[PDB]
Design a protein around this ligand. Structure first.
Ligand SMILES: C[C@@H]1CCc2cccc(c2)C[C@@](C)(N)C(=O)OCc2cc(nc(N(C)S(C)(=O)=O)c2)CC1
Length: 365
């Protein structure tokens, strides 16, 4: 494959984030940067912190330009404050280009950096609409596309480290066909879920509930996060389908873990979950099917697991444990996201087409 040099350019895991090396400034300062499709700011630790191995030293970069404006970014989890500027940025195991990008130098933070995660900054790959301080601060990928001929597309294979292929699709990273769902709105990577099944049994909720108040794809969130009403129905259904064994109720709430003798985890007793996504043709959908190996996240002779489906008050979030099944293509150029079975008794699947009527009615307005 022509994209071979980008294969395996990611390290990390679902619980702590996946990261890529990025080289900033002149002379080069290389840092580990969280790959985040749920936000739109590029920002790096720029001062000592207990959880940081290295940080950006602006004074040592001759190409750094201070924008003389501060920025504050609150996330679903954590927040940071810093100073805005621009500097030269390249991705050594990514595209063969160097761009002048906005960069926020993080000087203070709260509950953001994670001990032992090995990343020192964040690459927000979503759109300008959700950038801070506002949509005038051009996100990194926008600068990349504006300043270079790199195609307006990237793809993520999260294993399952992983691969971020920038500017194309690497056919070695998936099997079968790619199936595409429209990007509903260019802010988050917003999609539309049209049906949910647990072991082939329809959850039978009004599809508007699945997307209230939005459904997004976020590589920087661990879990499948669901609106409360959906979470409740899904857990009731999963519990019923896995009755071969009994689990404490707090397990389903993430307040308890269960551990099995290494190699004895009874995967076969847990159901598969299918999420149907709106397709590219009228009344057409496809499904991605999620295994217990995905939604039971590993945390001696015992293997401990946390239930990785949880509640949200801000809509559905298809996080890393969902993406780990799949090669996911963020086709910005054609405003669509593709899913295929990742090259990394049951298997994760992407299947279609299905006939689903009134799919337009599933989205929040
Ligand atoms: C991979 C994550 C680490 C990287 C990370 C930390 C903190 C913020 C972000 C990204 C940015 C953004 C935009 N991704 C964000 O705000 O995610 C919400 C989030 C993160 C995390 N857990 C969340 N959940 C509460 S859970 C356990 O249900 O998956 C939600 C921590 C794991």
């Amino acid at each position: 494959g022509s994209f071979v040099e980008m294969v395996d350019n990611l390290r990390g895991k679902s619980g702590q984030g996946y990261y890529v090396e990025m080289t900033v400034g002149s002379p080069p300062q290389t840092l580990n940067i969280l790959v985040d499709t749920g936000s739109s700011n590029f920002a790096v630790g720029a001062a000592p912190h207990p959880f940081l191995h290295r940080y950006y030293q602006r004074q040592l970069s001759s190409t750094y330009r201070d924008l003389r404006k501060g920025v504050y970014v609150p996330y679903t989890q954590g927040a940071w404050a810093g100073e805005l500027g621009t500097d030269l940025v390249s991705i050594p195991h990514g595209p063969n280009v160097t761009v002048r990008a906005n960069i926020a130098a993080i000087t203070e933070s709260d509950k953001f950096f994670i001990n032992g995660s090995n990343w020192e900054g964040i690459l927000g790959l979503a759109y300008a609409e959700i950038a801070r301080p506002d949509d005038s601060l051009e996100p990194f990928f926008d600068s990349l596309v504006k300043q270079t001929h790199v195609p307006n597309l990237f793809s993520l294979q999260l294993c399952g480290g992983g691969s971020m292929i920038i500017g194309g699709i690497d056919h070695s990273l998936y099997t079968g066909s790619l199936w595409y769902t429209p990007i509903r709105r260019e802010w988050y990577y917003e999609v539309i879920i049209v049906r949910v099944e647990i072991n082939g049994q329809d959850l039978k909720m009004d599809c508007k509930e699945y997307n209230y108040d939005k459904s997004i794809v976020d590589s920087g969130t661990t879990n499948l996060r669901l609106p409360k009403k959906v979470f409740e129905a899904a857990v009731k259904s999963i519990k019923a389908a896995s009755s071969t064994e009994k689990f404490p109720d707090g397990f389903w709430l993430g307040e308890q873990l269960v551990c099995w003798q290494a190699g004895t985890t009874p995967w076969n007793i847990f159901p598969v979950i299918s999420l149907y996504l709106m397709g590219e043709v009228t009344n057409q959908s496809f499904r991605i099917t999620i295994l217990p190996q995905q939604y039971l996240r590993p945390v001696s002779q015992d293997d401990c697991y946390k239930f990785a489906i949880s509640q949200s008050s801000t809509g559905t979030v298809m996080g890393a444990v969902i993406m780990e099944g799949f090669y996911v293509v963020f086709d910005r150029a054609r405003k669509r996201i593709g899913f295929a079975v990742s090259a990394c008794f049951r298997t994760a699947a992407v299947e279609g087409p299905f006939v689903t009527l009134d799919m337009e009615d599933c989205g929040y307005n």
